Structure formats: C-alpha cells, structure tokens
Design a binder for these strands. Structure first.
Ligand code: NA
Ligand code: NA
Length: 95
RNA sequence: GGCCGGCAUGGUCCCAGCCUCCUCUGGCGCCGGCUGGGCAACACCAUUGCACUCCGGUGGCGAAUGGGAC
C-alpha cells in the first residue's frame, strides 16, 4: 500500500484517453509548486498505462506533493499517488 | 491502399456539394470476387498496472452528387 519516502512519487489511476505529451505537461502544470521536477515519465504500453513517475529533486517536495494532491481530480479522475518502490535513474546518478 | 470479373453508360470542361485507417489526373454508375501495409489518427474491448528499452488487440473501402456551359 505504501513504500518508504522516495525521491520519485508513483502516481497511478490517471486518465488513459489523454495523450502522452499533453498529460506530461498538465501534471507539471499542477505539480510545479512543491519542488523542482527533474522529469515526468509517462508510458502508453499495455500494463505501463494509467500510471506516471514524477521525479522530485528534494525529498521534502515529494513529501508535500503526495499529501496535498492525494485524491485530487485530474481529467475527471481522482489521483491515486504513492511513493516509488526504488530510486529513479537520475537520483541513482547522484548518490 | 493495389488487382480482377460481369453489366450498364454518347462524350470534354464549369459551379458548388459529398466520401475516407491508408496524398485533399485522389475518388464519387450497379453487382460480384482476389489481396497488402499500418495501428499514426478516430473508435471500441481488455487492462488498477513500479518504470527508467520502443512494444495489448480489433473495426472502419461494407464509402460518397445534383445541376449547368457547350
Ligand atoms: Na497487384
Ligand atoms: Na493502440
């Protein structure tokens, strides 16, 4: 149900009908206040659909990005967000 | 999107209209067969999925007009 506080927040239960680049921008449009986002990862695959990965620089940013945006409607769909199971490749490059 | 066959139709331009997965001298008379490339768009079904490798599948072409200048 919940993982240990990661740099990336695993957001799922998103709108499938929305295109990749459009959704990748609209998420940034409402998430660019908690902290500096490195890159959002959006896929259109079979199982990889419906979810996204918002990589945050500061951990405290992703901490407040999860608790505030939880259940917030997005394209007529409530956002089900979690912490990432493992650190992202960009974060792995840091330390 | 490409081929074939049966039939029907005097023929060349002009205005506007109309069609579609497959360029907006593209195509737009009926009936019947053969067959391809791609899911990019649109639709629908499946999927509640932890990724850093791009990657589910299917339908649609079984489509579309009159009038005029000679
Ligand atoms: Na041929
Ligand atoms: Na698809």
């Amino acid at each position: 149900p919940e993982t240990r506080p990661n740099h990336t927040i695993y957001i799922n239960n998103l709108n499938e009908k929305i295109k990749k680049d459009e959704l990748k921008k609209s998420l940034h449009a409402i998430f660019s206040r908690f902290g500096q986002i490195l890159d959002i990862l959006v896929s259109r695959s079979l199982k990889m659909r419906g979810q996204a990965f918002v990589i945050f620089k500061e951990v405290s940013s992703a901490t407040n990005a999860l608790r505030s945006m939880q259940g917030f409607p997005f394209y007529d769909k409530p956002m089900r967000i979690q912490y990432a199971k493992t650190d992202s490749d960009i974060i792995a490059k840091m330390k």
